[PDB]
Write an enzyme that holds these catalytic residues in place. Structure first.
Site, short mmCIF file in Angstrom:
data_model
loop_
_atom_site.label_atom_id
_atom_site.label_comp_id
_atom_site.label_asym_id
_atom_site.label_seq_id
_atom_site.Cartn_x
_atom_site.Cartn_y
_atom_site.Cartn_z
N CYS B 46 -7.98 -34.88 74.66
CA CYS B 46 -6.83 -35.45 74.95
C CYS B 46 -6.28 -34.02 75.76
O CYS B 46 -5.91 -32.94 74.58
CB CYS B 46 -5.93 -35.93 73.75
SG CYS B 46 -4.55 -37.29 73.76
N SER B 48 -2.76 -34.44 75.40
CA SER B 48 -1.54 -33.73 73.77
C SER B 48 -2.01 -32.73 73.59
O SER B 48 -1.90 -31.91 72.34
CB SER B 48 -1.64 -35.29 72.66
OG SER B 48 -1.06 -36.53 73.20
N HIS B 51 -1.52 -29.80 75.07
CA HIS B 51 0.12 -29.28 74.74
C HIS B 51 0.33 -28.66 73.78
O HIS B 51 1.38 -27.62 73.27
CB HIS B 51 0.71 -31.02 74.28
CG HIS B 51 1.04 -31.86 75.63
ND1 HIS B 51 0.78 -31.33 76.92
CD2 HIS B 51 1.29 -33.51 75.94
CE1 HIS B 51 0.66 -32.85 77.81
NE2 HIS B 51 1.00 -33.61 76.88
N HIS B 67 -6.95 -35.14 67.90
CA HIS B 67 -6.85 -36.43 67.01
C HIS B 67 -7.66 -37.29 67.36
O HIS B 67 -8.14 -38.45 66.48
CB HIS B 67 -5.40 -36.62 67.54
CG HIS B 67 -5.54 -36.30 68.50
ND1 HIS B 67 -5.07 -35.35 69.29
CD2 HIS B 67 -5.05 -37.13 69.53
CE1 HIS B 67 -4.69 -35.48 70.39
NE2 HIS B 67 -4.21 -36.71 70.91
N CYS B 174 -6.89 -42.84 70.67
CA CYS B 174 -6.40 -42.51 71.36
C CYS B 174 -6.32 -43.05 72.63
O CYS B 174 -5.45 -44.27 73.00
CB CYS B 174 -5.87 -40.80 71.01
SG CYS B 174 -4.45 -40.60 71.85
N1 NAD Z 1 2.34 -41.60 73.22
C1 NAD Z 1 0.75 -41.74 73.03
O1 NAD Z 1 0.76 -42.03 71.55
C2 NAD Z 1 0.12 -41.09 73.42
C3 NAD Z 1 -1.79 -40.75 73.65
C4 NAD Z 1 -2.34 -40.19 74.55
C5 NAD Z 1 -1.57 -39.67 75.71
N2 NAD Z 1 -0.51 -39.24 75.72
C6 NAD Z 1 0.27 -38.16 76.93
O2 NAD Z 1 0.17 -38.96 77.90
C7 NAD Z 1 0.01 -37.50 78.71
C8 NAD Z 1 -1.33 -38.11 80.31
O3 NAD Z 1 -2.62 -38.31 78.90
P1 NAD Z 1 -3.73 -37.82 79.91
O4 NAD Z 1 -4.65 -38.01 78.50
O5 NAD Z 1 -4.04 -39.07 80.66
O6 NAD Z 1 -3.62 -37.09 80.31
P2 NAD Z 1 -4.48 -36.49 82.21
O7 NAD Z 1 -3.76 -35.09 82.19
O8 NAD Z 1 -5.61 -36.93 82.02
O9 NAD Z 1 -3.39 -37.31 82.97
C9 NAD Z 1 -2.09 -36.68 83.59
C10 NAD Z 1 -2.59 -36.74 85.13
O10 NAD Z 1 -0.73 -37.35 85.88
C11 NAD Z 1 -0.83 -36.23 86.75
N3 NAD Z 1 -0.23 -35.74 87.68
C12 NAD Z 1 0.42 -34.86 86.88
N4 NAD Z 1 1.50 -34.59 87.22
C13 NAD Z 1 2.21 -35.31 87.80
C14 NAD Z 1 2.99 -35.73 89.30
N5 NAD Z 1 4.16 -34.81 88.65
N6 NAD Z 1 3.41 -36.76 89.52
C15 NAD Z 1 2.11 -37.84 89.70
N7 NAD Z 1 1.11 -37.69 88.74
C16 NAD Z 1 0.86 -36.27 88.05
C17 NAD Z 1 -2.40 -35.57 86.79
O11 NAD Z 1 -2.69 -35.41 88.20
C18 NAD Z 1 -3.74 -36.39 85.82
O12 NAD Z 1 -4.75 -37.11 86.74
C19 NAD Z 1 -0.19 -37.10 78.29
O13 NAD Z 1 1.34 -36.43 77.40
C20 NAD Z 1 -0.47 -36.86 76.73
O14 NAD Z 1 0.47 -35.92 75.99
C21 NAD Z 1 0.33 -39.94 74.23
ZN ZN Z 2 -4.45 -38.45 72.79
#
Ligand code: NAD
Ligand code: ZN
Ligand code: NAD
Ligand code: ZN
Ligand code: ZN
Ligand code: ZN
Lengths: 374, 374
Positions: B46, B48, B51, B67, B174
């Site tokens: 993930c 995160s 991060h 996680h 998640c």
């Molecule tokens: N709130 C929660 O409980 C929770 C759960 C899971 C993930 N998250 C968070 O959500 C975010 C994304 O997670 P993911 O697992 O999908 O990751 P991921 O990196 O696969 O998704 C990010 C996507 O957004 C794109 N992107 C980056 N910059 C961009 C921009 N400026 N404009 C448009 N698109 C853009 C990237 O190219 C990528 O495709 C992370 O910050 C993660 O930590 C939060």
């Molecule tokens: Zn997560």
């Protein structure tokens, strides 16, 4: 009589920013197609009007401010089907065209025909109805209640109960509805909930009324002016805290009081800092915060998004989320039935001529609502 | 057997920020009272976690992250009642003590026992189970799934069906649940609405599966990586836009496309700027914007409160607002009943040892969910 001809009358014209209102004679042109000319009976003094003086709420000057009022239709323009002469009406600062996506949505009330987001200071046809010292005087929020006579668009007026006490119901035109609605309509305060209201003036107390009506078990009023405490408690506040009585930051105090955040917080002041505080004070994992106070022009608030990520809900709203034209007539009727009371807000009743004194009463924190009778 | 004794196995220890997960031998202490030790079967990479590496998400280092995962109960400590050895379980990075304020709340899920806002990087008792090079290693969100064996407190673990394909359902830990919940629970997408999803990663795609499941007639996916478009459309996107292809800021383009603004907007990237953009793209009078992406530690965003005053609702949530221990078993049960597809998020399967390469793919945009098998 007056119908069909330009009506000269006294109005409170605001020429410059941070300058007193100038009671002068203005030429109020007759209502055009789908416009309504109203004889003002009672106008309330809302903080938003003062915002135009300070520059907090930018709108084109010179302007005839005022939006919280009630009156009687002098004459109607061609095509007006909703109101007739002699009709007691309340000018709606938030119109309800009924034809836009927002008006057709069952939850939105902010009609796109509003002149709030991007003020022009005209009617819907882009022109002015006021002329003063030659120069055309702009309108405020499509209402301009600071005049013995005004002209509004048909979509920004509602016919209310014929037996309504205009001097009291004019509050429904803004203050009350806003607060009340922000409580039961926007936030939707629940039975047994705990709320924290920031700012205890006309709108703030009205939020307290809404919280109490909803059954909020605990209501915390927050104001730096202790003189506002007595009334707040009178309308429903279970306690009041003054940020400047302690040493530590208020959210710490509120967090400890509410034991981890309130269910509902309301920002009813109009400051970017208190807006963030209201958000913070509601419980991080399920708290609802509603911004009622109008923020200072062009100003952005800096906040940490984690306030939201944890689970907080941040909201804002115009006229308490109430669909103005459909709601106002209904709110007046409810006031007629005595479901809510406007009297607690009315603290000073002065003549239209003493408008500036009423504003000084507001500015000194001595008044809640000053009702100008015409 | 190992039940009742220290287990020597391998884990992904992140010693320093912006450094590779050193796959080395760590000792996992037996579970203490009310704790559970699980054998990891499959864990999802993930963003995160990345991060934690980049420093965007802060937690005490050295740490064994991870996680999103699923495994089997190796042994339980004293007083554990909810799970027994041999049970297929999913670690809940968001606890459900079932006692605290938020847990007792009907719609809250960010249980106060969480280790997200104030990262201690340990168990509930403030102590760790990990040993490596003699140095005690930290836990990540009380799960630490980047290890063949981890010790999670009883409240941070849920028993799923014995017939659950652990290598696929680990996504419910998640990724999927977060996005799906953000759409169907946190935002509550209506039937026939226009949704705008920012970020098309594992989480983002899941949000799409939610809008799609909610009945959203339109779903505009937004991403600066055009490669992510195909799968988005595959899971629900009616269209997808690459912001870089426009001379005007994307929010405007979105407002134009939705004829005034979207009903529900989602931010699943973790950028401050994109959060403000997603909010602004939803209809000012009734738009709902849900932030999911984790922001850079301690960073504040500058936004205009008028976006809210007009009527917008802005909110966020951890784990899609799902009460982890409650929902988790059911979410797996729904997958069992073919209620939602997890496969679309799975693009790469790699053994735990090739952990870095999995992070390589993610960082290069060559993947969505890379499932690590043990
Ligand atoms: N709130 C929660 O409980 C929770 C759960 C899971 C993930 N998250 C968070 O959500 C975010 C994304 O997670 P993911 O697992 O999908 O990751 P991921 O990196 O696969 O998704 C990010 C996507 O957004 C794109 N992107 C980056 N910059 C961009 C921009 N400026 N404009 C448009 N698109 C853009 C990237 O190219 C990528 O495709 C992370 O910050 C993660 O930590 C939060
Ligand atoms: Zn997560
Ligand atoms: N959005 C809408 O539809 C709508 C409608 C009506 C009023 N408003 C706005 O709501 C705000 C309040 O309206 P009102 O008529 O009740 O105003 P008001 O002046 O009567 O009350 C504002 C109150 O907040 C208090 N206050 C000021 N600074 C404070 C601080 N730093 N900490 C704590 N308390 C503080 C003041 O003492 C005062 O009691 C204004 O910004 C007004 O423009 C918005
Ligand atoms: Zn409208
Ligand atoms: Zn007002
Ligand atoms: Zn809890």
């Amino acid at each position: 009589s007056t119908a069909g001809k330009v009506i000269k009358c006294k109005a409170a014209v605001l020429w410059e920013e941070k300058k007193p209102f100038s009671i002068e004679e203005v030429e109020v042109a007759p209502p055009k197609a789908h416009e309504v000319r109203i004889k003002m009976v009672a106008t309330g003094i809302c903080r938003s009007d003062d915002h135009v003086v300070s520059g907090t709420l930018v709108t084109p000057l010179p302007v005839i401010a005022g939006h919280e009022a009630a009156g009687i239709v002098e004459s109607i323009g061609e095509g007006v089907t909703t109101v007739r002469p002699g009709d007691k009406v309340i000018p709606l600062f938030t119109p309800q065209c009924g034809k836009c996506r927002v008006c057709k949505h069952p939850e939105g009330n902010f009609c796109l025909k509003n002149d709030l987001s991007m003020p022009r200071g005209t009617m819907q046809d882009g022109t002015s109805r006021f002329t003063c010292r030659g120069k055309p005087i702009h309108h405020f929020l499509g209402t301009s209640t600071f005049s013995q006579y005004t002209v509004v668009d048909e979509i920004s007026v509602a016919k209310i109960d014929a037996a309504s006490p205009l001097e009291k119901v004019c509050l429904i035109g803004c203050g009350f509805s806003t607060g009340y609605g922000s409580a039961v309509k926007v936030a939707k305060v629940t039975q047994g909930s705990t709320c924290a209201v920031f700012g205890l003036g006309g709108a703030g107390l009205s939020v307290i009324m809404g919280c109490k009506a909803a059954g909020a078990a605990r209501i915390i009023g927050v104001d730096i002016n202790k003189d506002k405490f007595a009334k707040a408690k009178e309308v429903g506040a279970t306690e009041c805290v003054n940020p400047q009585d302690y040493k530590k930051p208020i959210q710490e105090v509120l967090t400890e009081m509410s034991n981890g955040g309130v269910d509902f917080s309301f920002e009813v002041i109009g400051r970017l800092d208190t807006m963030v505080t209201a958000l913070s004070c509601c419980q991080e994992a399920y708290g609802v915060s509603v911004i009622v106070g109008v923020p200072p022009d062009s100003q952005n608030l800096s906040m940490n998004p984690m306030l939201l990520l944890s689970g907080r809900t941040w909201k804002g709203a115009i006229f308490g989320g109430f669909k103005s034209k459909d709601s106002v007539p209904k709110l007046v009727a409810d006031f007629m039935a005595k479901k809510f009371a406007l009297d607690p807000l009315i603290t000073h009743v002065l003549p239209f001529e003493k408008i500036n004194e009423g504003f000084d009463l507001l500015r000194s924190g001595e008044s809640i609502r000053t009702i100008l009778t015409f």
